[PDB]
Amino acid sequence: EREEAVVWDILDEVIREHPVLLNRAPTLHRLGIQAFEPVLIEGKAIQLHP
Amino acid sequence: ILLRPVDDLELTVRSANCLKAEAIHYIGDLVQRTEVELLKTPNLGKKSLTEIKDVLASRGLSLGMRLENWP
Amino acid sequence: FGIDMNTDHTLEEVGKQFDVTRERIRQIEAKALRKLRHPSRSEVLRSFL
DNA sequence: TCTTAAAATCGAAGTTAATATAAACTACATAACAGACATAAGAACAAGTTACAGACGTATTACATAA
DNA sequence: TTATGTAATACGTCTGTAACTTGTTCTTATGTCTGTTATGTAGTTAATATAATTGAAGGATTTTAAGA
């Protein structure tokens, strides 16, 4: 909650190679949900590969 | 460990009694004194001293080191 | 206190364990309490405040 | 074999946070709330019972001194 | 050489501390009984009066049972 730095290093280590699932509605086919490796970025928006 | 008070050593009431009677309050004050200086304390006998030695040696410490500029 | 046990017990049936004496049970429990209060074996419990 | 009324269905997320009309008196039994008392449980003090510690006193041996 | 007398030394030990334990004694929290008030239930009223009720609405297609 206090958002210390070591929390940020721990977060990097947990997300190091943990894939996440991205989805967009409507899910017309199975390509509407795909797994990506996350890269932590400053901001509030998800960056998507073109 | 050098910054904990004497009671942390968990001394027998006889021991803690004696060392509180000589105003020996800090483990530095325990170590800078020697065995003969403690054996001269009234009511501090040989077996009391040996159990002090055992318990203090449990914590990686011993009697008689010289601590500079204590405290 | 009833740890790992279905019911809590008062001094009576705690005495009923070996010797049925009240003040000895109280003094034993108080000795155990100040022994646990010792800062050397209570840091792991102080974190739960 | 041909009308004719029913029955069922009709994309995902996302957000979203409600209202609003329209018998009285009497009699009885029961439940709830408050107060006081007795009881069981704990806190406090003091005593007794017991072994061990801590330094002293003693006993023993060896060195020194005296004959 | 040997009695003697001091001195180191090791072992009992008398006493001071402390642990274990009980008596008992006082205090308090709780459970219970009892008395009083509010709540909840129930019964009755005697000009005469005698077939609701309120909406609601541009649907478009299929399939499947009743009626003839």
SS3 category, B64: coil
Size of interface B-C (CB pairs under 8 A): 6
In our burial notation (b when 16+ CB lie closer than 10 A, e otherwise), range B3-28 reads eeebeebebeeebeebbeeeebeebe
- Contact (CB, 8 A) for B25 and B6: yes
CA torsion, points B8, B14, B19, B23, in degrees to nearest 10?
Answer: 110
Nearest to A37, CA basis, from A23, A22, A18: A18
d(CA B33, CA B6): 14
- Contact (CB, 8 A) for A33 and A27: yes
Does B10 contact chain C (CB < 8 Å)?
Answer: yes
CA to C1' distance (Å), from B38 to D50: 29
